[PDB]
Paper text:
We also solved the crystal structures of these menin mutants, showing no structural changes in the MLL1 binding site on menin. We found that point mutations in menin do not change the protein structure and only minimally perturb menin residues surrounding the MBM1 binding site. In contrast to the predictions from computational studies, the crystal structures of the menin mutants revealed that these point mutations have no impact on menin structure or stability. We have also calculated the electrostatic potential for the wild-type, G331R, and G331D menin variants and found that in all cases the MBM1 site on menin has a strong negative charge that is minimally perturbed by either of the two G331 mutations. Point mutation G331D reduces the binding of the high-affinity MBM1 motif of MLL1 by 10-fold yet maintains the potent interaction with longer MLL1 fragments and shows a very slow rate of dissociation of MLL1. Surprisingly, we found virtually no activity of MLL1160 with the meninG331D mutant up to 200 nM, suggesting that this complex might be much more difficult to dissociate. Then, we performed competition experiments with the G331D variant and found that incubations of 24 h or longer are needed to observe dissociation of the meninG331D–MLL14-43 complex. A similar effect was observed for the competition with MLL146. These results demonstrate that meninG331D binds MLL1 with a similar affinity as wild-type menin, but this complex undergoes a very slow dissociation and longer residence time, most likely due to the additional negative charge in the binding site introduced by the G331D mutation. As expected, no activity is observed for the G331D variant due to slow dissociation of the meninG331D–MLL1 complex.
Residue numbers in the entry: 2 to 53, 74 to 386, 399 to 460, 549 to 588
Write the structure that this text describes.
């Protein structure tokens, strides 16, 4: 049951009323994840999915929210019998966690598009019987909280979600699917994936949420998009205000991606008196370095993308070099394709487009151009070095000749006289970690880049055409 004290702010008639409810729940011993997710999903439904009849804000009446809450708790209590799963020591069993995951999974519509917008919340679960992948994980944690299982918490990588539980919160369990066409591992640990040093499991440096961080997750999960060309200003404002609430309370300290999301929101619409976007992107990086061994990729991608948007070539290249310095110490494994796609798009689309415009601006007499800065050439080289080093030791390869054309083109955007300034030193100065780039060193300073030799050095190809 919802408690009396949780009910006093209703009806919620505005963004700020929603914020008050979040503040009240975050001041309680354990914020109520089910209440909060149902509220967010209700207002997201009426602000983004169906705005018919909207005049300011979709008033959330207690009768409506309480009935949805009861629909959830009735479903979970009825289908999960706790007597079947005795709890030693205030901690949950693997079988109980699996039962909860099965109850949520089995409730879902048989067939639907799993990557649609607005299927993240408990409101979607109850009203549409649809959840996205991490939405199932969140729903398992919200169900477990409603059942009194204080030890079950959300675990997050940069591309997946599962749960932690058990003695000292030291157990892991898969509770949802990952990607499209992968082998389901529900009920199993994540320890094989940690041991293979995949990006997917972050070498074990993934997020282990407390309840406050699970609130942060649902807030990050708000989706303001009405359509491909339009976002709800109301939802953007709500998300921004709730992220500052969390920030002020300390609950983003261990949440790099939330800090990046808030930076993105501040760039779109700055809040007077608050840190700049740049400051917030750097805080996200600092969070990753402090709490996650500097093993996260996206904090640097958040930063590079900001600099790219602002056509800051130098700082974008720096940030992408830093990204690649993280990825170098991973093995590229079979379910890591989302980060491969991101690196591919940066090397083979984004950087080319940035340097093409920089070349045109140099022709028109730009000063201080990244294309005349040997430190920028070094950043480009460090980016490729980290990708080559990533590939070393990996069960699946990364580079192929489709990368080589863009490498040759990007190298050629810097004149020989600029490229010659970088001194490549062994263990502007640069050290290579990869054997591919070490072998490419002499090719990098010729006036006219040897395209064929670069292709041979970047790829597995070792022969040239017969005839």
């Amino acid at each position: 049951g919802l408690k009396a004290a949780q009910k006093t702010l209703f009806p919620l008639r505005s963004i700020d009323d929603v914020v008050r409810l979040f503040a009240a729940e975050l001041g309680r011993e354990e914020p109520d994840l089910v209440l909060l997710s149902l509220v967010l999903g209700f207002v997201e439904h009426f602000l983004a999915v169906n705005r018919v009849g909207l005049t300011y804000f979709p008033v959330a009446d207690l009768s409506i929210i309480a009935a949805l809450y009861a629909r959830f708790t009735a479903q979970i209590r009825g289908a999960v019998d706790l007597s079947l799963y005795p709890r030693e020591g205030g901690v949950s069993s693997r079988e109980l966690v699996k039962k909860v995951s099965d109850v949520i999974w089995n409730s879902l519509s048989r067939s639907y598009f799993k990557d649609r917008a607005h299927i993240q919340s408990l409101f979607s679960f109850i009203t549409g019987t649809k959840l996205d992948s991490s939405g199932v994980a969140f729903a398992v944690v919200g169900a477990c909280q409603a059942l009194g299982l204080r030890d079950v918490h959300l675990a997050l990588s940069e591309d997946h979600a599962w749960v932690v539980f058990g003695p000292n919160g030291e157990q892991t369990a898969e509770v949802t699917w990952h990607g499209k066409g992968n082998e389901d591992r529900r009920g199993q640990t994540v320890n094989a994936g940690v041991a293979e040093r995949s990006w997917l499991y972050l070498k074990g440096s993934y997020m282990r949420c407390d309840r406050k961080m699970e609130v942060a997750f649902m807030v990050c999960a708000i989706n303001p998009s009405i359509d491909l060309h339009t976002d709800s200003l109301e939802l953007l404002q709500l998300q921004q205000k709730l992220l500052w609430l969390l920030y002020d309370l300390g609950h983003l300290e261990r949440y790099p991606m939330a800090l990046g999301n808030l930076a993105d929101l501040e760039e779109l619409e700055p809040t007077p008196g608050r840190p700049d976007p740049l400051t917030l992107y750097h805080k996200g990086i600092a969070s990753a370095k402090t709490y996650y061994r500097d093993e996260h990729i996206y904090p640097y991608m958040y930063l590079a993308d900001y600099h790219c948007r602002n056509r800051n070539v130098r700082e974008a290249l720096q940030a992408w070099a830093d990204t690649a310095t993280v990825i170098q110490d991973y093995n590229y494994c079979r379910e890591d394709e989302e980060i491969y796609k991101e690196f591919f798009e940066v090397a083979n689309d984004v950087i080319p487009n940035l340097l093409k415009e920089a070349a045109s601006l140099l022709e028109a007499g730009s000063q201080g151009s990244a294309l005349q800065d040997p430190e920028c050439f070094a950043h480009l080289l460090r980016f490729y070095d980290g990708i080559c080093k990533w590939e070393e030791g990996s069960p699946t390869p990364v580079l192929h000749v489709g990368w080589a054309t863009f490498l040759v083109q990007s190298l050629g955007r810097f004149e020989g006289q600029v490229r010659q300034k970088v001194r490549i030193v062994s263990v502007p100065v640069l050290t290579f970690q990869s054997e591919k780039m070490k072998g490419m060193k002499e090719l990098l300073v010729a006036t006219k880049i040897n395209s064929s030799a670069i292709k041979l050095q970047l790829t597995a190809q070792s022969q040239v055409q017969m005839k």
